[PDB]
């Protein structure tokens, strides 16, 4: 089995720019290399086959090229629907078809601070015996964000899970929900529950809380 | 050209599943068929490949010994028998078709089938509330397996909605959050309801979110 | 920079040899020293792109830079270039010198000695398979290395050099059929030929795998016939490596080929014998005649279904020829176009395989007829028989072309009638397709026959039956008997048996062109009186005299009969 190594993991570019994706083959695979495009929730779609030949219906700004064991996929007039994840695949090895790790095209836009919200556990969920305190960060960019939970101003770490959305198709931003879950027993013992949000768009850490 | 998949779902570690791919729109008997999987949030992994006549069969090292690929050329169908299932086999499984003369690239893929290998068992969610430019939402908690579908106001409230990717809890159950951004003035004037649907457990839940 | 990449991949020598070929195939009249200087300028420019890949033109493709150097727009530029590749160049006959003169030049500068070899061959065969030309230069060099140090240099060298000359002519004619298949009838017809040839070769391979190798094979020969010799060389290299990687899914006869170096591996794979057939192979009735999706497949996936029929028929019959198989596939095609619009399609196409018996015996009978004739006559007289036969078919063709084509046609007897009765048809008929394409490309430069133009342009699969069904031409007006063709001098006694027979045969054509209704036995009377004439006067003490005097006598008797 031949290993295909893709670079980079993420490409941040603005519409109209040119993306240059790398796929490096451990051994020579000839031109038996295909490129695939995948958008969230969808099956992959064949873009390039035979290293350079584009599939029927693929626009002309997509162009694959080979130089030795290093393959390049180039997208020239980046449109908003060209931003997806791209995978390379070889079909030279007799034993296996191997893919690359993938490269994600992300729309680069202006730094945008998150609107932070906080929600206290519902009474119905407190009847069940579990309390979920949810912290919501709305429509921010870039994707990197840090969220710390301070329960009675004591750093808690290990009882939360956060989840980030896909880049919004309208404003190219991200949203984040971080949920802190403790027992209803453990919840009622305290009073001050704070969410500390750190982002590039924030001149200082912003906190939202309730008693 | 259609690749209609069937037969996935949840299993327990060590269990068995049988994936189906019903093809139509092309001379199925002339194409090599492939199985490709993708774990949630991960990349593409090639699983197996069977030739036109079924003469040449290939497996990835990971599934060698446990998975068995086959096809029925009379029924235009591709099969994947998954035995001794593992938690690392949890993924969406795609039947892809190889190009007939352009190489062994995969030009048509199926919709995909989700296979979840867990010791958890199918459970419907508890749709708790997330009460209040203001933000309200729904907490769809402790369900298995994926997915749930969430809509707001029967589907007429789409702008501003953020249904977050589900996160797997230590219990083996999933939980997500669906928030919507509504104007602060609309609170009290408009009734916001989130409709949760979990087809695996046939659980339909409507929960009116109201301001405390 | 594609030009700096290609140069670092090949090295200077191999890069220069393929650029030398490319120039010699296009500029077939410029002298060797002018080609060398043209190659050095492209090599010196490639060394500046290695130094600075951001230089003047290092971003242009090497194919484009070649035409740029040629002129001293695209893609019409190359297409216009291709129209001026001469299949019958007005160049001197390659007379090779004395053995001691060749060995002196070979030891004085071997690198130049082989460049003139590459130059002289490529300029005369502008469609020669460039990778195979490099292999020919390796064997040409090998013979000089051995024989220039042998005790008897000429006894060593000349036989080897004659074998390379014959092999090079065959290679040039095989590749010219490939290029003409692509240029004249399209890549769709070349892919059909390759799917039937490769299904015979690799019966273990799946239709998708044979179709994959045919796509790669169509690109290798597209580049070698459309001029990009450096991409052709690398594409057939990649295809040999791919065939050897996947050999377990293709053929069991490749293991020996895959251990060889690049040149010999690619050559070995092209010459590999057919693989054994898989034992569990169904009859074609099941899926193509008796099935219930026959018209649905023909309607829904016409090219995959029909190309699947060709593949499945070809691997079951390596004793058929490729043109016979393509005819079977077209018959099956046209039967389904007729039958699928019928009331009950199965009720009419149930007997489709019954129309293949006529098509299969027709070449079988022709080959048995010609092999039977060749056993009696022998190569020389068998050629004479075909010379009479084809001069009567197309008397407008030039006498040099009629002699060359008919001699080659008569070599099928020597080549293919020594094989077992069941291995004869692929040998015979595929060679006949190669020789008739020689006539088709020589006649397309200066067309003089409506029949030849007809057979050559109509189809490509039915060329041999087209010519074989040709009767004696009635439209032809006999040539005025000129006696300058039947009066030889004493120089004929110093000629080779070949060169002398060419002189005898050249008379036979001009005789038939004059008397197109002569009986075959009557034409053998003159020729038998011809050979007795040359034997007698080459024995005479006064050879010059009785060639003049007895020559006049022999002319009288021929005209009288």
Parallel, antiparallel, or unpaired: how do β-strands B9-11 and B113-117 relate?
Answer: parallel
Sign for the CA dihedral angle at C28, C31, C37, C43 comes to positive
**B109 CA: distance to closest CA in chain C (Å):** 18
Pairwise CA distance, residues A159 & A119, whole Å: 16
Check the annotation: does C9 bind a ligand: yes
Place of tokens 């003469």: B55
| DSSP designation for A168 | P
* Cβ contact, residue pair C214, B30, below 8 Å: no
Pairwise CA distance, residues B65 & A181, whole Å: 41
Pairwise CA distance, residues A137 & A199, whole Å: 10
Check the annotation: does C528 bind a ligand: no
Place of tokens 């149930």: C350
Contact C316, C281 (CB under 8 A): yes
**B163 CA: distance to closest CA in chain A (Å):** 8
> Structural domains in chain A?
4-107 (2.60.40.10), 115-210 (2.60.40.10)
* Cβ contact, residue pair A125, B141, below 8 Å: yes
Place of tokens 């089938």: B113
Exposure string for C194-210, b = 16+ CB within 10 A, e = fewer: bbbbbbbbbbbbbbbbb
Residues of B in contact with A117 (CB under 8 A): 135, 179
* Cβ contact, residue pair C242, A92, below 8 Å: yes
Distance of CA C155 to the CA centre of its chain: 29
Pairwise CA distance, residues B183 & C115, whole Å: 84
Tokens of C405: 């084509």
Contact A38, A45 (CB under 8 A): yes
Check the annotation: does C228 bind a ligand: yes
B100 touches chain C (CB under 8 A): yes
Residue whose C-alpha is closest to residue C433's, from C174, C221, C253, C183: C174
Pairwise CA distance, residues B6 & C275, whole Å: 40
Q: For chain C, report the end-to-end CA distance as a whole number of angstroms.
A: 73
* Cβ contact, residue pair B56, C249, below 8 Å: yes
Residues of B in contact with A138 (CB under 8 A): 135, 162, 179, 181
* Cβ contact, residue pair A163, B165, below 8 Å: yes
Touching A (3+ Cβ pairs <8 A), the chains are B, C
Check the annotation: does C219 bind a ligand: yes
Pairwise CA distance, residues A60 & C49, whole Å: 28
Q: Give the DSSP H/E element, type plus range, for residue A20.
A: strand A19-25
**B190 CA: distance to closest CA in chain A (Å):** 20
Place of tokens 């492939």: B34
Residues of B in contact with C245 (CB under 8 A): none
Residues of B with CB under 8 A from a CB of A: 34, 36, 43-46, 49, 58, 60-61, 94, 99, 102-107, 109-112, 126, 128-131, 133, 135, 137, 139, 141, 162-167, 169, 175-177, 179, 181
Place of tokens 């971080």: A178
Of the candidates C5, C239, C245, the beta carbon closest to that of A94 is on C245
How would you class B60 by CB atoms within 10 Å of its CB: exposed for 0-12, middle for 13-18, buried for 19 or more?
A: buried
Mutation target vs A (from B57, B100, B103; most A CBs, 10 A cutoff): B103
Distance of CA B194 to the CA centre of its chain: 22
Pairwise CA distance, residues C277 & C313, whole Å: 12
Alpha carbon separation from C375 to A73, A79, C361, C417, C527 (Å, rounded): 63, 74, 21, 8, 19
Of the candidates A30, A67, A92, the beta carbon closest to that of C5 is on A67
Pairwise CA distance, residues C396 & B30, whole Å: 49
Residues of C in contact with A94 (CB under 8 A): 245-246, 248-249
Adjacent-strand bridge partners of B190: B187
Pairwise CA distance, residues C159 & C75, whole Å: 45
Q: Give the DSSP H/E element, type plus range, for residue C338.
A: helix C322-339
Helices (H) and strands (E) in chain C, counts: 28, 0
Alpha carbon separation from C301 to A58, C186, C304, C432 (Å, rounded): 22, 21, 6, 34
Distance of CA C449 to the CA centre of its chain: 22
Residues of A in contact with B179 (CB under 8 A): 117, 136, 138, 175, 177
Contact B132, B187 (CB under 8 A): yes
Pairwise CA distance, residues C474 & B169, whole Å: 94
Strand blocks (E) in chain B: 2-6, 9-11, 17-24, 33-38, 44-50, 57-59, 67-72, 77-82, 91-98, 106-109, 113-117, 126-130, 134-143, 149-152, 161-163, 167-168, 174-182, 192-198, 203-209
Tokens of C265: 């591996």
Of the candidates B30, B55, B101, the beta carbon closest to that of C212 is on B101
Check the annotation: does C221 bind a ligand: no
Mutation target vs C (from A2, A28, A31; most C CBs, 10 A cutoff): A31
A residues 28-67 near C, CB within 8 Å? 28, 30-32, 67
Pairwise CA distance, residues A47 & A54, whole Å: 6
Residue C281: Cβ within 10 Å count? 12
Check the annotation: does C480 bind a ligand: no
Contacts of C400 (CB under 8 A, 6+ apart): C506
Tokens of C224: 């070698």
Adjacent-strand bridge partners of B194: B152, B207
Q: Give the DSSP H/E element, type plus range, for residue A182.
A: strand A174-183
Residues of B in contact with A165 (CB under 8 A): 162-165
> Structural domains in chain B?
2-117 (2.60.40.10), 126-209 (2.60.40.10)
Adjacent-strand bridge partners of A181: A132
Alpha carbon separation from C213 to C101, C219, C236, C412 (Å, rounded): 46, 10, 11, 30
* Cβ contact, residue pair C245, A28, below 8 Å: no
| DSSP designation for B187 | B
How would you class C286 by CB atoms within 10 Å of its CB: exposed for 0-12, middle for 13-18, buried for 19 or more?
A: exposed
Residues of A in contact with B34 (CB under 8 A): 97
Pairwise CA distance, residues A87 & A44, whole Å: 9
Residues of B in contact with C308 (CB under 8 A): 27, 29-30
* Cβ contact, residue pair C245, A92, below 8 Å: yes
Pairwise CA distance, residues A211 & B37, whole Å: 46
Check the annotation: does C471 bind a ligand: no
Residue C494: Cβ within 10 Å count? 9
Pairwise CA distance, residues C158 & C148, whole Å: 11
């Amino acid at each position: 089995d031949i290993v295909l190594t893709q670079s980079p993991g993420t490409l941040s570019l603005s519409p109209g720019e040119t993306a240059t994706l790398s796929c490096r083959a451990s051994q020579s695979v000839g031109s038996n290399l295909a490129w695939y495009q995948q958008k969230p929730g969808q099956a992959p779609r064949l873009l390039i086959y035979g290293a350079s030949t584009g599939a029927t219906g693929v626009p002309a700004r997509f162009s694959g090229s080979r130089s030795g064991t290093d393959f390049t996929l180039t997208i020239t007039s980046l449109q908003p629907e060209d931003f997806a994840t791209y995978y390379c695949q070889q079909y030279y090895s007799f034993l296996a078809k191997t893919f690359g790790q993938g490269t994600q095209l992300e729309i680069k836009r202006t730094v945008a601070a998150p609107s932070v919200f906080i929600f206290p556990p519902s009474d119905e969920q407190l009847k069940s015996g579990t309390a979920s305190v949810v912290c919501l960060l709305n429509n921010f960019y870039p994707r990197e964000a840090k969220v710390q939970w301070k329960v009675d101003n004591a750093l808690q770490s290990g009882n939360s899970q956060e989840s980030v959305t896909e880049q919004d198709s309208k404003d190219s931003t991200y949203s984040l929900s971080n949920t802190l879950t403790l027992s209803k027993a453990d919840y009622e013992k305290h009073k001050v529950y704070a969410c500390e949000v750190t982002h590039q768009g924030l001149s200082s850490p912003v906190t939202k809380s309730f008693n | 050209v259609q690749l209609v998949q069937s037969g996935g779902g949840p299993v327990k570690p060590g269990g068995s599943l049988r994936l189906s791919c019903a093809a139509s729109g092309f001379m199925f008997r002339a194409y090599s068929m492939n199985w490709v999987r993708q774990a949630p949030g991960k990349g593409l992994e090639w699983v197996s490949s069977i030739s036109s006549s079924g003469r040449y069969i290939h497996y990835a090292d990971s599934v060698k010994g446990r998975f068995t690929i086959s096809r029925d050329n009379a029924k235009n169908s591709l099969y994947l028998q998954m035995n001794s299932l593992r938690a690392e086999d949890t993924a969406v499984y795609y039947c892809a078709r190889e190009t007939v003369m352009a190489g062994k690239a995969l030009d048509y893929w199926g919709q995909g089938t989700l296979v979840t290998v867990s010791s958890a068992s199918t459970k419907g969610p508890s749709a708790s509330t997330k009460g209040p430019t203001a933000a309200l939402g729904c907490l769809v908690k402790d369900y298995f397996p994926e997915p749930v579908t969430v809509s707001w106001n029967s589907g007429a409230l789409t702008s501003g909605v953020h249904t977050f990717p589900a996160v797997l809890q230590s219990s083996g159950l999933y939980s997500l959050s669906s928030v919507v951004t509504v104007p602060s003035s609309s609170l009290g004037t408009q009734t916001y309801i989130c409709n949760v649907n979990h087809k695996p457990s046939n659980t339909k839940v409507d929960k009116r979110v109201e301001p405390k | 920079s594609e030009v700096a990449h290609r140069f670092k991949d090949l090295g200077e020598e191999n890069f220069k040899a393929l650029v030398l070929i490319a120039f010699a195939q296009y500029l077939q009249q410029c002298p060797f020293e002018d080609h060398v200087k043209l190659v050095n300028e492209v090599t010196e420019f490639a060394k500046t792109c290695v130094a600075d890949e951001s230089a003047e033109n290092c971003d242009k493709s090497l194919h484009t830079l070649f035409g740029d150097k040629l002129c001293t727009q695209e893609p019409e530029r190359n297409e216009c270039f291709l129209q001026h590749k001469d299949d019958n160049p007005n160049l001197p006959r390659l007379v090779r010198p004395e053995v001691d003169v060749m060995c002196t030049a070979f030891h004085d500068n071997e690198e130049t000695f082989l460049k003139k070899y590459l130059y002289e061959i490529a300029r005369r065969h502008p469609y020669f398979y460039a990778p195979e030309l490099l292999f020919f230069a390796k064997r040409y060099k090998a013979a000089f290395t051995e024989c220039c140090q042998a005790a008897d240099k000429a006894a060593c060298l000349l036989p080897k050099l004659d074998e390379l000359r014959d092999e090079g002519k065959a290679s040039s004619a095989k590749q010219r059929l490939k290029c003409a298949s692509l240029q004249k009838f399209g890549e769709r017809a070349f892919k059909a030929w390759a799917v039937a040839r490769l299904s015979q070769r690799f019966p273990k391979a799946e239709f998708a795998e044979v179709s994959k190798l045919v796509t790669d094979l169509t690109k290798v020969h597209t580049e070698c016939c459309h001029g990009d010799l450096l991409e052709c060389a690398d594409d057939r290299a990649d295809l040999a490596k791919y065939i050897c990687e996947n050999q377990d899914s293709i053929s069991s006869k490749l293991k020996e080929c895959c251990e060889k170096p690049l040149l010999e591996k690619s050559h070995c794979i092209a010459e590999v014998e057919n693989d054994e057939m898989p034992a569990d192979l169904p009859s074609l009735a099941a899926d193509f005649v008796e099935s219930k999706d026959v018209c649905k497949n023909y309607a829904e996936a016409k090219d995959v279904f029909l190309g699947m029929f060709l593949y499945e028929y070809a691997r079951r019959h390596p004793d058929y020829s490729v043109v016979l198989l393509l005819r079977l596939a077209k018959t099956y095609e046209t039967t389904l176009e007729k039958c699928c619009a019928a009331a009950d399609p199965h009720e009419c196409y149930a007997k489709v395989f019954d129309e293949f018996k006529p098509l299969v015996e027709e070449p079988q009978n022709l080959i048995k007829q010609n092999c039977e004739l060749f056993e009696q006559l022998g190569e020389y007289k068998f050629q004479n028989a075909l010379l009479v036969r084809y001069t009567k078919k197309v008397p407008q063709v030039s006498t040099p072309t009629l002699v060359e084509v008919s001699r080659n046609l008569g070599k099928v007897g020597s080549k293919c009638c020594k094989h077992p009765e069941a291995k004869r048809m692929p040998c015979a008929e595929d060679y006949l397709s190669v020789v008739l394409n020689q006539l088709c490309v020589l006649h397309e430069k200066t067309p003089v026959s409506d029949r030849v133009t007809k057979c050559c342009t109509e189809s490509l699969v039915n060329r041999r039956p087209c010519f074989s069904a040709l009767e004696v031409d009635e439209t032809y007006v006999p040539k005025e008997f000129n006696a300058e063709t039947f009066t030889f001098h004493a120089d004929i006694c110093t000629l080779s048996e070949k060169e002398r027979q060419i002189k005898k045969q050249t008379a036979l054509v001009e005789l038939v062109k004059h008397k197109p209704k002569a009986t075959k036995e009557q034409l053998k009377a003159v020729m038998d009186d011809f050979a007795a004439f040359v034997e007698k006067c080459c024995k005479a003490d006064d050879k010059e005299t009785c060639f003049a005097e007895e020559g006049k006598k022999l002319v009288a008797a021929s005209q009288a009969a």
